[PDB]
Write a protein that binds this ligand. Structure first.
Ligand SMILES: CCOc1cccc(C(=N)N)c1
Ligand SMILES: [Cl-]
Ligand SMILES: [Cl-]
Ligand code: NA
Lengths: 300, 305
């Protein structure tokens, strides 16, 4: 038993992390087969930060303007191209530590592990969610750009996030590994701000199911709710709408615990109305929204 | 910026995990140089576990009774000894992935990363503190026994924990890598309970410093205090006594923020007495006590391994 924010073992990702330098700018790159992936803003100077013309700055670069270092080894760049906001440096060596991997773009509510890196050296691993507003609440200092987010279901590393920037509210924005930003963000230092964030309702319900599996029943009630009445209440607390897809996804946890999805919704409505009255659920005094139904089943 | 419960990168330890089977029991082993370390209770049947004589149960066994699998490779066990509650299985082959490592015994209040494993396969990594009552609040299922806890200092992995059992309340108990239990526990199926736990004061103060560094500042106040005054409130709220050693260890964080420890203790004095007045600190409604001063400095300064 027990229930923790658990990350994937980071070793398969550790063996892919390198340091990329261009001019006076150093950040992290991801070395898979014979390609190093990094944020394209590595090629920006101090004036290029507001309105970088990336096609223009990249055509002015030669393979030898990029210093790529895998621990102590210098890797030789032999090609470079841009895909959206990601730079792809071709190198003369395939990474012998390349794992089975794929690139996947995730939806809001999805969780993943982040391997925070500085100078191509891993610092730490933690769990994140893609917030409904397409940001992540990370822990990222200067030098962390090019750090990645991943899942490892079944020996295959699914890359879903590369870190590009910190927004003024202290939250983080980045791309999939095809270089397309999550949300409306751009790799320019023009004024940008995240939308008002919301709570990931389906994940809160999954975590209440976790709590019941782990033996805590205090917050259940004898009530039920319609899906529509639930959404009308939950949205007044800045909760995301719960769709029939969400209700379908919780079916297995419903079945394991014998609590119907809309009975659990009634429990959530009451918890939003009452708070916890000094109690905790799975060590938390807040309603936790960064565990998915799939994470709850994996850990339980 | 931002602040997260962050494990060490687990790759150096993933390379050490193996599967150990003795009769019907499968669990995890740690493969370092030419030895596999696992809990000695792997040798016990259900019947044995009620009142085991490990001396006797062990002499009865032989190398061929232990199956060690490093992925899809069989290791040859050529020797077996016991050190306290840990079984040492000598194998014919040195782990070519053995990192630079020490065995270390940690103090209550100190944190470490757990690599949760099943059938010798790494499954997940999370950060824990050794509670004052010598339990950890882990996440462990059947087959997690032999999972290890570790810290990394530069290139050197310090192994501090091996998982042995779950207590009735859902908390976890284990040994250092020399087989000495953390806390007043024994490796037999009998009646055992975690002592009443306390809050790790110096870690809460460390976390309040992390909050300030991230611009959560509401709980600050004009007041200050003393050890004796603060300690008398701590004891009342089931908080560990704060010592002069703790104050000196927070010194860096007191510096970098301009809140001196007893200044911050005055903030914490007020939070225990009055609550959080319906606010949060770094997205928690609780006073978080599983971050050490070192954890806060390392995370808020980008230390790398
Ligand atoms: C037009 C939609 O009608 C149905 C019927 C049965 C199931 C569902 C569902 N996704 N749970 C939807
Ligand atoms: Cl997804
Ligand atoms: Cl004995
Ligand atoms: Na103060």
């Amino acid at each position: 038993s027990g229930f923790r924010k658990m990350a994937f073992p980071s070793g398969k990702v550790e063996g892919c992390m390198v340091q990329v330098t261009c001019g006076t700018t150093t950040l992290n790159g991801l070395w898979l087969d014979d390609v190093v992936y990094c944020p394209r803003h590595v090629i920006c100077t101090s004036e290029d930060m507001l309105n970088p013309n990336y096609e223009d700055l990249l055509i002015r670069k030669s393979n030898h303007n990029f210093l790529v270092q895998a621990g102590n080894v210098q890797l030789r760049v032999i090609g470079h191209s841009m895909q959206n906001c990601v730079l792809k440096l071709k190198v003369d060596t395939a990474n012998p530590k390349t794992p089975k991997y794929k690139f996947v773009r995730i939806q809001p509510g999805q969780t993943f592990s982040v391997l925070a890196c500085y100078n191509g050296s891993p610092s730490g691993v933690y769990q994140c969610a893609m917030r409904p507003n397409f940001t992540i609440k990370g822990s990222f200092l200067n030098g962390s750009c090019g750090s990645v987010g991943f899942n490892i279901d079944y020996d295959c590393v699914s890359f879903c996030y590369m870190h590009h920037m910190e927004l003024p509210t202290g939250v983080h924005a980045g791309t999939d590994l095809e270089g397309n930003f999550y949300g409306p963000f751009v790799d320019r230092q023009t004024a940008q701000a995240a939308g008002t964030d919301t709570t990931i309702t389906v994940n809160v319900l999954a975590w209440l199911y976790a709590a019941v599996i782990n033996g805590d029943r205090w917050f259940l009630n004898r009530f039920t709710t319609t899906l529509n009445d639930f959404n009308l209440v939950a949205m007044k607390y800045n909760y995301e709408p719960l769709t029939q897809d969400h209700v379908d996804i919780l079916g297995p946890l419903s079945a394991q615990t014998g609590i119907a999805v809309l009975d659990m919704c009634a429990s959530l409505k009451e918890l939003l109305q009452n708070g916890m009255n000094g109690r905790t659920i799975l060590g938390s005094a807040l309603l936790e929204d960064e565990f998915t139904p799939f994470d709850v089943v994996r850990q339980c």
